[PDB]
A paper describes a structure:
Here, we describe the structural characterization of an apex-targeting antibody lineage and autologous clade A viral Env from a donor in the Protocol C cohort. We previously characterized the V2-apex PCT64 bnAb lineage from an elite neutralizer in the International AIDS Vaccine Initiative (IAVI) Protocol C (PC) cohort (Landais et al., 2016, Landais et al., 2017). In this study, we combined negative stain and cryoelectron microscopy (cryo-EM) single-particle approaches with X-ray crystallographic studies of early and late autologous Env-antibody complexes to decipher molecular details of the co-evolution of HIV Env and the immune system response over the course of several years of chronic infection. Comparison of Ab-Env complexes at early and late time points reveals that, within the antibody lineage, the CDRH3 loop rigidifies, the bnAb angle of approach steepens, and surface charges are mutated to accommodate glycan changes.
Guided by neutralization data of autologous antibodies (Landais et al., 2017), we selected a late time point PCT64 Ab to make an autologous complex matching our late Env with a late antibody. This antibody was isolated from the month 35 sample, PCT64-35S (late Fab), and neutralized late M18 virus at an IC50 of 9 μg/mL. We solved crystal structures of both the early and late Fabs at 1.6 Å and 2.4 Å, respectively. Here, a sulfotyrosine was observed at position 100F of the late Fab CDRH3. Whereas it is difficult to directly compare the Fab structure with that of PGT145 due to the difference in the CDRH3 angle, alignment of the CDRH3 hairpin alone demonstrates that the sulfated tyrosine at 100F in the late Fab overlaps with the sulfate at Tyr100I of the PGT145 Fab (McLellan et al., 2011). The overall structure of the late Fab was similar to the early Fab, apart from CDRH3, which at the early time point adopts a β-hairpin at the base but is “splayed” at the tip, resulting in a very different paratope. Ala92 and Arg93 are replaced by Glu92 and Thr93 in the late Fab, creating a negatively charged patch (patch a). In addition, the nearby Asn31 of CDRL1 is mutated to glutamic acid, adding to local negative charge on the surface of the late Fab. In the late Fab, sialic acids of the complex-type N130 glycan would create electrostatically unfavorable interactions with the negatively charged surface of the Fab.
Author numbering:
A (entry chain H): 1 to 52, 52A, 52B, 52C, 53 to 82, 82A, 82B, 82C, ...
B (entry chain L): 1 to 27, 27A, 28 to 94, 96 to 213
Write the structure that this text describes.
Amino acid sequence: EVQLVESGGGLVKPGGSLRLACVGSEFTFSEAWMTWVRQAPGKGLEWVGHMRPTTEGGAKDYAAAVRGRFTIARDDSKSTLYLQMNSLKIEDTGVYYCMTGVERGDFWSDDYSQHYNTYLIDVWGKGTTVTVSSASTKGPSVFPLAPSTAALGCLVKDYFPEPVTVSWNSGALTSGVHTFPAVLQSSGLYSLSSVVTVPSSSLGTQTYICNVNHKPSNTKVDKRVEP
Amino acid sequence: EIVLTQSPGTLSLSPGDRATLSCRATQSVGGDYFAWYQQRPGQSPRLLIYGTSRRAAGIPDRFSGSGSGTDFTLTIDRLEPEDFAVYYCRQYETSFTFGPGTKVDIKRTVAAPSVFIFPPSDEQLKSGTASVVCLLNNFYPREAKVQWKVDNALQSGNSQESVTEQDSKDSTYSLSSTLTLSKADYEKHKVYACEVTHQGLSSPVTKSFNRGE
């Protein structure tokens, strides 16, 4: 199965540099027209640049926003596509994808026939995440969102970077749970809210713990939300 | 510098309906250089149609591409559950951009939001900051308006909103609004109100608390 694998993404400061790699397999790499696409959090697909097949001259192209800062390179012998990212900006943050369209052979036979065919396979890698920020890594402080159908929750505030995991009662409570997408604050730190609706009769009966996990900072917090 | 546009941004339809998605270009894009893509949350984009009208191998035949010049159309005969997602057009002749994208969500019956308001915790208060949270829970359609009023004074510039993706279980959305203030400003006032307007609400709904209690 044709596939692409990206690597090199990571956390970098504004004005820093980063080199992304993309390894292809099961297609003639020298003949592939390679493309880099990116996607900011909650935003659409943005074309970054491409490099024509080596067999066609290998001409490159770039989006105006990255021209002069990003360079695309190619190593056919290693089936690898590169993206050198210089002078990184905060708006460069997002998932980066490696993509191409390639030919594939299809064969079938009858008691009376043999048929050979080629078709297009448009392939994308699973992406690598580029985070450009001047913030420092920090675990969240978890504050209760106290109730008094009832609603209660936990406020997962001032953490960096993404992501953070929230469960309720060690995963026993999943119905009525809404963990909202984080918002980036003016401080450069993320803030998030996780809520759950429960019967009002349970407020005195059942105890509710939100289990918050921020692996980048080695932070585990179990916060009991009381009336 | 051909620019692509897609109408609308959100297309609300019932499962089983026929969907028609538009993409427009500021200048003509050759027929062999236009494509349609699908993307679902957390996944890579998937090619549906290439060369204007060619279905990609492995793509169900209910997907169909048409158009020419500056006007292009993607049609989905009957929307299956896996079809409610974002769709992007793409050009690749002399310009190489994607369209802004069209989201197809499930047209549901109108549901008014359940509104809850949460005061800042005592733990957060002794750190010098106060965030008050307003939850609009399980409403449809997605359009909602939250307004913070502190002692009857309209706030602006000191809150942030977050909206969930359409819920995969009941096809509603939820929204959290966070009003952030310092201890000093928070202890200065008494009535903190979250005022909500939604198509399913005949009149604005307010959930408030008093700082002391």
